[PDB]
Amino acid sequence: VSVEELKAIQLRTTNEATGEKRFGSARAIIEDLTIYKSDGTTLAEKPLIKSGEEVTFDFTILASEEIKDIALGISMSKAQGGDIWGDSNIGAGSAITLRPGRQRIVYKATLPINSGDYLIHCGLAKVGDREELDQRRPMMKVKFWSARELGGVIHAPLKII
Amino acid sequence: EVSVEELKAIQLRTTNEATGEKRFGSARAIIEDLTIYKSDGTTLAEKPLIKSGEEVTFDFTILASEEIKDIALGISMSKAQGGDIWGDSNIGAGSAITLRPGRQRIVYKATLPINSGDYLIHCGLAKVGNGDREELDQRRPMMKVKFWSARELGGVIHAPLKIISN
Ligand SMILES: [Cl-]
């Protein structure tokens, strides 16, 4: 596959439901992200996440050629304001080299996030001068739900002694 | 026993200027003190240093001039700027509290997945209803707290990735 084709995909499959602002050289792209809850259902099948549960991020990354030493980042924010959560393979100490074509990257995180509506952001880059390959802001929406309501975004219910 | 005028005087006297505390309320009862244990029993500093994910104990000393029923004792955290990133109370926890005259001790615990950074602690005492809500002692912010993490993450949610791909 070629960069021009990827540039076309990048511009076409932009998510307007979230008003996705997408940019990058698109030498490789975040082709798709499927999100699993701990019961094995996808967000598509069931669009909620319970506060504190194990979430799995199933990426498909599509590259026109081999690219070494890339960073694949994921983050979440409220409808407004900066990210409330974010991390990447670089932080986690796992080096990634993209091979030509379609390939699978899987992340996990246990997210103690309070009830509410959030936005998921994803970024692909080569970490020489840094190269932004494919930034997807926001890539999709997600709603969290809890047994009861807390202040803020941290899910940490009090225990009365 | 203890009068409201005395509680008013303690309220003023022990306002925390170091945190620029804004403090108000009728002071029929006050949050006389909050002390924070890392739950294994030690007392943390004036500025507690807590690891992301640790269980933390909040030990309130409450002073009441008379009996007050239907009490809300809330606690929350913010960054130096912005609204609270975390907060809860006995009301949320479905635990009723009645204050008796004089001094008494109320204890909360929570396990706080909060990223490394400097934060501010707020706490508030109020009579819930039985008419109109009465603010007894609101303390914003009453002390500082520092979190540290094994490695730095974005935002305030402590939730490091596991990379399954290898
Ligand atoms: Cl999905």
Between chains, do B88 and A153 touch, taking CB under 8 Å as contact?
A: no
Q: How many domains are contained in chain A?
A: 1
CB contact under 8 A, A91 and B151: yes
Chain A 56-75, CB below 8 Å of chain B: which residues?
Answer: 56, 74-75
Q: How was this structure determined?
A: X-ray
What letter would DSSP give residue B8? H
Residue A130 in tokens: 């840094």
Chain A contact present for B131, CB below 8 A: no
B165 touches chain A (CB under 8 A): yes
| Contact partners, residue A157, CB within 8 Å, separation at least 6 | A148, A150, B88, B92, B93, B110
Cα of B50 from ligand 1 centre, angstroms: 35
**CATH number for B162:** 2.70.50.60
Q: Which one-letter amino acid corresponds to residue B85? A: I
Q: What are phi and psi of A12, to 5 degrees?
A: -85, -50
What does the radius of gyration of chain B's CA atoms come to, in whole angstroms? 17
- Contact flag A154-B157 (C-beta cutoff 8 Å): yes
Among B76, B112, B151, the residue with its CB nearest the CB of A151 is: B76
Which helix (H) or strand (E) segment is B81 a member of?
none
Residue A99 DSSP label: P
CB B28 within 8 A of CB B4: yes
Q: Which of A119, A122, A141 is nearest to A23 (CA)?
A: A122
**Interior CA angle at B140 toward A119 and A117, to 5°?**
15
Q: What is the resolution of this structure in A?
A: 2.2
Identify the domain containing residue B37 by its residue range: 1-166
Chain B residues with CB inside 8 Å of A77's CB? 155
State the smallest CA–CA distance between residue A72 and chain B in angstroms.
11
In whole angstroms, what is the distance from residue B10 CA to residue B16 CA?
A: 12
Pairing between strand A101-110 and B162-163? antiparallel
CA distances from A47 to A18, A143, B99 (A): 15, 7, 44
SS3 A5: helix
B81 touches chain A (CB under 8 A): no
Q: Is B40 on the interface with A (CB under 8 A)?
A: no
Classified as helix, coil or strand, A92 is helix
Torsion of Cα atoms, A35 then A41 then A46 then A48, to 10°: -60
Residue B139, strand partner residues: B23, B123
Report how far residue B55's alpha carbon sits from residue B39's, in angstroms, rounded to the nearest whole number: 6
Q: DSSP for B50-95?
A: EETT-EEEEEEEEEESS-B-SEEEEEEEE-SSSSEEEEEETTTTT-
What number of other Cβ atoms are within 10 A of residue B67's Cβ?
Answer: 10
**Contact yes or no for A76/A20 (Cβ under 8 A):** no
Q: What is the spatial distance between Cα A96 and Cα A89, in angstroms, rounded to a whole number?
A: 8
**Residue B3 to residue B89: CA distance in whole angstroms:** 26
